[PDB]
Amino acid sequence: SKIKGIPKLDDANDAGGKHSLECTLILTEGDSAKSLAVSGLGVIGRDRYGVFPLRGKILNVREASHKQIMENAEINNIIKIVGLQYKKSYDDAESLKTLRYGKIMIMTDQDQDGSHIKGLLINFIHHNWPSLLKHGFLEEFITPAKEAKEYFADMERHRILFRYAGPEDDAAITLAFSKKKIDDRKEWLTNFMEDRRQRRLHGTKHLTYNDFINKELILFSNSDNERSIPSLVDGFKPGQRKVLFTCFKRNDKREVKVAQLAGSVAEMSAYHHGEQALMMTIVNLAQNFVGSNNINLLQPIGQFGTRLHGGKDAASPRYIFTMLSTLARLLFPAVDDNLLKFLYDDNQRVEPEWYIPIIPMVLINGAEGIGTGWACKLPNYDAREIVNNVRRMLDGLDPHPMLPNYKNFKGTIQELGQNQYAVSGEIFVVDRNTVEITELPVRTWTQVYKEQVLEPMLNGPALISDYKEYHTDTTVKFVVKMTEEKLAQAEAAGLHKVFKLQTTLTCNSMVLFDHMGCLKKYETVQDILKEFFDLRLSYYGLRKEWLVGMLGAESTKLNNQARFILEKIQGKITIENRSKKDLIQMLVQRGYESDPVKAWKEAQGPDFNYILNMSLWSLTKEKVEELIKQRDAKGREVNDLKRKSPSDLWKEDLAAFVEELDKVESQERED
Amino acid sequence: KGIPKLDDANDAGGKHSLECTLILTEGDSAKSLAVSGLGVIGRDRYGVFPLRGKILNVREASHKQIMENAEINNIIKIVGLQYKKSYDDAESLKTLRYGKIMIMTDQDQDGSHIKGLLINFIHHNWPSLLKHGFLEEFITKEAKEYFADMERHRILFRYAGPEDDAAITLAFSKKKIDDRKEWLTNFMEDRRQRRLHGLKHLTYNDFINKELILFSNSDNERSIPSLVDGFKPGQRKVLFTCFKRNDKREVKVAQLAGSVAEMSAYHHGEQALMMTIVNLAQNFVGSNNINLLQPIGQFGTRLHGGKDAASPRYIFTMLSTLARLLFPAVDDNLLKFLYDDNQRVEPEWYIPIIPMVLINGAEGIGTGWACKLPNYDAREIVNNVRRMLDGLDPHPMLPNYKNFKGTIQELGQNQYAVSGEIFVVDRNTVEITELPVRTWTQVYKEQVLEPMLNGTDKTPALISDYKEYHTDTTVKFVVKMTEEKLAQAEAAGLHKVFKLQTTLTCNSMVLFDHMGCLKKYETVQDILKEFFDLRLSYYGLRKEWLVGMLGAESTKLNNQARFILEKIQGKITIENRSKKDLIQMLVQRGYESDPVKAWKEAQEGPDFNYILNMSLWSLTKEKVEELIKQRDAKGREVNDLKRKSPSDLWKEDLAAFVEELDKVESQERED
DNA sequence: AGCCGAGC
């Protein structure tokens, strides 16, 4: 017995014979981990150790469909390598001779995603062959080319075996991977998030399955929510926020390759995941077809996908470029960066907890994500309509209700109820034998509608005679031919119903992280707008309070610089051939202040470098007049700021954003 | 059917088969642009199929290689062609599913090579199809505009007589190698006789001699190294980027490849560029004697000859400390940097302190010519350079590979015998401690020792057992034999039997000289001599450049020190005086315009900014004393440089390189 | 019959 049809398998020499139960199959996380295991086993390892690589997450066979299980290539390989059989028990020690391996050792990364792969394989064995768990079938190889040989030489220190201890292990596995335990995972994760934050005070060989689920796998389930559930403040996820942080710091004025940008994000923001997910995010942030972003913060310089296939027809990230949109810094003012709490990843400032935009971006581009226990789904909302409601709330008026709105969508979105909408396309009769379809429902892609609706109508009973296509890259135009009898019956039943041009939009899972990082469920879009409004209005007061101190410190600096230049050109003070110590002691004696900008930032010996680092040009005629004008202009800038309210500063940013939004969207219609 | 990536025409195979055209594109990216350009009307009589690069040259290929080519067999089934079948008249044109094949590639040199390979494929198997005008080309979203004006972009190949058969044979027959040399020699000659001046149907002869010849010349320019620096244009772009960025931290290879394409205008795929960076960083036995890039990661070992290198997305690299010592930064001011669309990209060549073309063994395969050089010892190269500086004759040099424990004996002119190490332990054991150069460990184990242990269908077994005790950089085989078999192996020669000796022939030392001319070199001493005269001439250029630059810097400090001394004594004042009055007074007092800028302008109003941009600190006591010391130190720096000779400057660079070479190679043995 | 490497 020896496998022949599996390429990536490095089967053990003694596997399949009578020493099969003494052999261990090593399932690795990827092909890179496979090479590290083969080089670590050396020559002695290939006798009773086999290595097979897994290409990521495996199928959750618990309550999975019968067709998906039999057609899973990754699982069918594991069954053939080990020699397992469905509906067969391995309790009586006998019948263990039909197995080619006696142990399965999981070696993955020591991160959260590695723990998820362990649990999925545990769930795979537990669901099909629970009798193997009561023995010693599953084990793991933990890690902290050359270092691999030291790990396998000290395998007993890195080898941990899973142990079945009773029904509490079956409940823990069911809690994590059963579709019927969704509500239990909410309570399971609510107690974890509570106990984790309630620890403000302060801060082996075998491992039971219950301890693995409730102390190791739960770290993935929480991290899965933290990476997939967006924030209410900026509408971002931690991965999306790292991309925009990097773009803000680099400030690229030229097209930048997506793959090149993804590499820059990983370094400057400490992105600890694969480049495929990061390049996926950058493409998602740049798409602008009907159904994606209402305001794309990155430009789609290249083939980023069309509405024909819903972005699936996007080119490779190695051939497409992107850059910040002109609306990015207008939505995220640079001055507001001084109010954010930037996080640290190993003494490196990486990203803030969240950005604070001028309008709720969580409603503009429709935040959406799937985590563990909870899920989020929000539709797109009109940017101008949101700005209007913000202006109304600044004047003390009640905000108008908002319906979902998608840019360049020619259909209709009618409200059926709270968080329930009817999205309809456009279809009208041309003559007694022709109908025209000029718009599809939101996120109903053209090729999918053609193959799943029009093709069954054309072939197999049949309803239409023929149809032609006259689409562009951004519009839809179907011309369908029918008989007079068939068309008359379609009008009686409803053209939008027959041609499947109406879909329902239900949004009863508006779960987001608040400003304090707590997970909360929101019932209406108005509740999100109100909570964002109070926080953003409070931070416009922080911006003014910060700008008054900074501009005031800059005004004091220019006062000392102008005083020194005026006192020097009049002979009141001299610095020629004077020692550094005597010059500093003379400046402090004449009432000159140390660097006020530095002193103000420290508040959040004497330093006169801001005076003496000025060029000799400063003593010339034209530079004296220029310095006085800048000093007076800075003084008027502080006074003009104190007279303004936080609402005034917000309306200024809103007006500047709407002005550029009109110009950008007008150029898009022309191009 | 049975071809996934094929978008077959609707009318292909039916009664309109001879009216259909098959579009063969250069890659899948061109395929997606061809289907979108045909629109809906195009799919009736136009099929699109993508080619994955260069296709097989079926003229002198083996019969087994032709039948097992998946790319060519697909083209045959789509068109419906048959081998040996003639297509002279209408007797056999009804069995074809397509009537025309249109080649759509990039408008670059490599696109022309794919056209010729497809022309060579049809001409060799079915020459009767060429007289009917079977092959066409499509020269160059925007695709819909191209296919709408197809008549402007559609050029048809025309057969005009026996001169077309000779032109195709000249380009793709292996018996026409010497003819391609003269074919390209006349091109390079006539090309240089045109620089004194300046600057629908298409015949196959005109395609070969006016379009494909541009690739064959560019193929040599990209694959044949230069004598000066031992680099190819692709390798030189990598070193330019690394020199310009000056990375002090580990940089990802894929991230570096993207930076090279932007900063040096690399107009090819990143896969080839990432290949070069890995090749430039390898340091195992058989690769580079002095690797200019560091192998921070899995860059391949001698077990598989670098083929076991990790993905370029997971390995890092950086400049070696010997790079800037071999290529001094001061010499960059003497190079002729090229321009790619008003962007300075790279020099024609770098000028290293030693002939790098001999250190790492430059080698490359072009069209007509090929290059192959072995590695030579760096210290022996430095010693011959020191001898030639003293007017002595350089000693002969044998190939030398770093950390190679074998022997390289000269059998004749440009012919050497490379042997490993094998010795007898006892009457039943032999030990192999070294393999010949570029004989990799895993290849030697599978192709030599395994047939000796088990035997083949032809050769019998020779050894009883063998063990392995290798490291990542050393080889140790312990082989067991019988007394009879060992006696016969010693009689025939242990190095002969165990395949531990290989022949090294170097009769193709073709390189580009300093003037860009292709030249064949008969001995290594001729390469060393031509490099020596050029490098010695540029050390005179460096001194001539340093005398002017240091002299200009000395003049600058003289004016700056004079102004500060004249200001602290009251001899000149600048307070509250106009810019025009201050500049006019400096010219009146004999102050010179910026000498450093004026000197650099000579290498192609009055500027006193270098005086007045100094800080106010310059007037203090300590800064006056510091400025005077810098002025006097620069003056002594000019005199100390004038006293040195171009030979003295060279000996300083050689001594500094050998000192660091000893430290690096000592740390490598420890690490 | 296949390596070497810069290209597709």
Add this chain to the structure above:
DNA sequence: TGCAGCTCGGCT
């Protein structure tokens, strides 16, 4: 250089 799978929750 391009192509294939899976998780997790809500909704259809």
Add this chain to the structure above:
DNA sequence: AGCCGAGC
């Protein structure tokens, strides 16, 4: 029977 997307 499968989309949505940040992960493997």
Add this chain to the structure above:
DNA sequence: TGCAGCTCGGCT
């Protein structure tokens, strides 16, 4: 995220 082909010339 990793895996497969080909050119071109000299040499084994």
